């Protein structure tokens, strides 16, 4: 008895039917095969459980054995779970560059990743070059960007310019990108976005031994602790190279530093589900970190 499933990438909707004992890995492989993605190590499948919680699909476990929200077809989102240390030397395929571009641009536009107004304009500039191609005074007449969402709401609200005025600045940059290929435009966007403080960071609310509210940041290079009201600059950093090991006991999270002097660091997460999520991102990120070196 086949099981109907739907998988959506940033710009595509895929329809599959799997058997009862299909594993996440088998579903995953069918997805990347369909869109011709070979740079698969960054991606994963997101689903919603019966309790309405977003979760990443375990690839080693059967799809049917993971409490995916009951429905026909089952619904999954194909998304990048991990980010490259540098897009330039890691994303070679157009499909991959496109998926990261679209996912990152969505997060920037939704104010997910903080972005200075000036940078938002430059970023929008590459997105327009990617979408419209070379600026052509004959076809791209004033107002040609009126129907495009190009800047995050936060930017629009801090600077009271009219849409026309924003478009004017965006257009001036657009004109300067003539000759830039669609794929190259997307990569330029990413090269800029990847230098943003909040780019590629998974934040989790935690508390330290003093009960102070903080954020745990997990990214490609290790872990960071942020003060509750500042997610841009780490309060303290824990690069992989300074980490002996990492473990969690239910809600307790401990970071044993390689160093002799430096003592251990304990942090508390609200739910065990959170700690499991953190450990998983820590494992995956570190793994990719080491592949960039030895494997």
């Amino acid at each position: 008895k086949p099981i109907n499933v739907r998988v959506t990438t940033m710009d595509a909707e895929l329809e599959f039917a799997i058997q009862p004992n299909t594993t996440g890995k088998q579903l995953f492989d069918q997805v990347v095969k369909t869109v011709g993605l070979r740079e698969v190590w960054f991606f994963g499948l997101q689903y919603v459980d019966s309790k309405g919680y977003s979760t990443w699909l375990k690839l080693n476990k059967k799809v049917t054995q993971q409490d995916v929200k009951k429905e026909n077809p089952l619904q999954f989102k194909f998304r990048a779970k991990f980010f490259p240390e540098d897009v330039s030397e890691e994303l070679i395929q157009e499909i991959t560059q496109r998926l990261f571009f679209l996912q990152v641009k969505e997060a920037i536009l939704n104010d997910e990743i903080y972005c200075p107004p000036e940078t938002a304009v430059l970023l929008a500039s590459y997105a327009v070059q990617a979408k419209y191609g070379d600026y052509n005074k004959e076809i791209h007449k004033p107002g040609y960007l009126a129907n495009d969402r190009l800047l995050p709401q936060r930017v629009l609200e801090q600077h009271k310019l009219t849409k026309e005025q924003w478009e004017e600045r965006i257009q001036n940059w657009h004109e300067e990108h003539r000759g830039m290929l669609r794929e190259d435009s997307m990569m330029e966007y990413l090269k800029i976005a990847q230098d943003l403080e909040m780019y590629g960071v998974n934040y989790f609310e935690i508390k330290n031994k003093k009960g102070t509210e903080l954020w745990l940041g997990v990214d490609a290079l290790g872990l960071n602790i942020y003060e509750h009201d500042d997610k841009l600059t780490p309060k303290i950093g824990f690069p992989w190279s300074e980490i002996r090991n990492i473990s969690f006991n239910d809600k307790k999270f401990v970071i044993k530093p390689i160093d002799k002097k430096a003592p251990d660091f304990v942090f508390y997460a609200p739910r065990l589900r959170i700690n499991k999520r953190i450990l998983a991102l820590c494992m995956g990120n570190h793994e990719l970190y080491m592949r960039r070196r030895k494997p």
Partner: peptide, 9 residues
């Protein structure tokens, strides 16, 4: 639950 993850050493 209890889970450990070796990073270095």
């Amino acid at each position: 639950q209890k889970k450990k993850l070796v990073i270095n050493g």
